Design an enzyme around this catalytic site. Sequence first.
Site, short mmCIF file in Angstrom:
data_model
loop_
_atom_site.label_atom_id
_atom_site.label_comp_id
_atom_site.label_asym_id
_atom_site.label_seq_id
_atom_site.Cartn_x
_atom_site.Cartn_y
_atom_site.Cartn_z
N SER A 145 0.86 -1.19 0.00
CA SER A 145 0.00 0.00 0.00
C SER A 145 0.89 1.23 0.00
O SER A 145 1.73 1.37 -0.91
CB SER A 145 -1.00 -0.09 1.16
OG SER A 145 -1.88 -1.18 0.98
N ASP A 242 -8.15 -2.95 -7.37
CA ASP A 242 -7.69 -2.69 -6.02
C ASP A 242 -8.73 -1.90 -5.22
O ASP A 242 -9.29 -0.91 -5.70
CB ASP A 242 -6.36 -1.93 -6.08
CG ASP A 242 -5.80 -1.63 -4.72
OD1 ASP A 242 -5.01 -2.44 -4.20
OD2 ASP A 242 -6.16 -0.57 -4.17
N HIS A 288 -6.91 -5.93 -1.60
CA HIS A 288 -5.92 -4.90 -1.29
C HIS A 288 -4.84 -5.53 -0.42
O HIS A 288 -5.16 -6.14 0.60
CB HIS A 288 -6.58 -3.69 -0.59
CG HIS A 288 -5.68 -2.50 -0.46
ND1 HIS A 288 -5.06 -1.92 -1.55
CD2 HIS A 288 -5.28 -1.79 0.62
CE1 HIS A 288 -4.32 -0.90 -1.14
NE2 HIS A 288 -4.44 -0.79 0.17
#
Length: 342
Positions: A145, A242, A288
Amino acid sequence: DLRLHLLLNTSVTCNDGSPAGYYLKESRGSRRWLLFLEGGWYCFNRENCDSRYDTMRRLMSSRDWPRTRTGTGILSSQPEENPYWWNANMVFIPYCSSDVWSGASSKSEKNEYAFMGALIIQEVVRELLGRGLSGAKVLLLAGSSAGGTGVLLNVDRVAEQLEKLGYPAIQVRGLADSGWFLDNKQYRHTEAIRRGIRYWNGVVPERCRRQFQEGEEWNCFFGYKVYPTLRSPVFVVQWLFDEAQLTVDNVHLPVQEGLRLYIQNLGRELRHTLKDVPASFAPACLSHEIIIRSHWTDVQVKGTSLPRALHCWDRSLHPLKGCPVHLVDSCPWPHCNPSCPT
Ligand SMILES: Nc1ccc(S(=O)(=O)Nc2ccccn2)cc1
Ligand SMILES: *[C@@H]1O[C@H](CO)[C@@H](O)[C@H](O)[C@H]1NC(C)=O
């Protein structure tokens, strides 16, 4: 268990001025070193950083950190959980700078908070060289991330740091998980990154900075723009749908034609940006992050798992028969790949 070490140079700090640090588990029979960058969004002005300090304080301060962390996924030392690098030296670097790992600004009478992400990475590398990193053959800078974007922004800086300190034999590489975003039109209606860079004194890689020039450094936070400027080998892991990308696009999942076309176009655009990325893994799933999840071994593209793809990448850096490195789904809807997580 990885064990906490606070930085010996206490002028390299988290947002609130407490020392930054790293968690370490050594493997003295290995010359491979994995440095993982934690993620967790960011903050970009006094008011929303104040809010983050109230309810996400561990991402802004080391005062409450535990003395150990369990290594999971690619940080696990068990071969069953981590077929790729189970015998490596393992490092987890907590994210306590709220700056997508780009900042180089100290707390002062002019600044309520310190934004030192770029300097934290460099200081961790420096202190590790005295704990065995000096004998390494490969340093893999990985992250998820905001940490995945942080790999793209910092991998070439780490490579330059080691060259100038006199370690030209250590091969620096990057693994960016879920940090490859598109600055696309929203389904329902980048300024925050622009404001953040000024607030943080953020730094971007030099070649990318020279392309876009002053005022436009925000462009280098987007993978498809910064990646072509990088010299170090970088493997890109990105879900085609995502969940963080869809959140900023104002998509929340009875899908009608307008949203169907929007979602299909988003996947086509992401796949297009990965066309000339030779080391990549991009499944057609709504999710994610992946690389420190315990069941990261489960997903496959065209019959190849992510741990296998990363092994094939290692072999390529010594096409390979039966050992692919470029793995991008062609089917156009989330969960058209049966191995997607549930
Ligand atoms: N279309 C779009 C996508 C992401 C963002 S961001 O503010 O979260 N910026 C970033 C950029 C790289 C990594 C993380 N966040 C803004 C707009
Ligand atoms: C500690 O880190 C700061 C920021 O990078 C740097 O200015 C200083 O020289 C460092 N101290 C030592 C002793 O290296």
